[PDB]
Design a binder for these strands. Structure first.
Length: 102
RNA sequence: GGCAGAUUACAAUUCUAUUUGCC
């Protein structure tokens, strides 16, 4: 969250999306606040859904990255505590937990 | 860093890489 200046943080973490959600739907729900950054290697928007390895069901968790950091900040200020696909969600500032194994 | 084209491989439990052209 506010634990960093986020001057280099353009990603938000999301929880509660749903067990049947899609990258395109999440992107359509976040793009209305600001431009989601697009992958130039894959052409899909920067969203990463997560899955349970013990059940194979979706965690309801995902990251979304923005083309600018103030858009990510507005996305937290706005989407945090709203609903998506008919499910309550929770947005906040992300980091790179990937860096523990990358 | 961004824009266009091309290539290959792998992964997570909170932001992929390589490569050609241009600034």
């Amino acid at each position: 969250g506010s634990h960093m200046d986020n001057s280099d943080n353009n990603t938000i973490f999301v929880q509660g999306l749903g067990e049947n959600v899609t990258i395109e739907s999440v992107a359509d729900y976040f793009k209305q606040i600001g431009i989601i950054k697009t992958n130039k290697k894959t052409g899909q928007p920067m969203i990463n859904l997560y899955t349970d390895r013990e059940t194979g069901k979706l965690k309801g968790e995902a990251t979304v990255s923005f083309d600018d950091p103030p858009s990510a900040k507005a996305a937290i200020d706005w989407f945090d505590g709203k609903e998506f696909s008919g499910n309550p969600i929770k947005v906040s500032f992300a980091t790179r937990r990937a860096d523990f194994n990358r």
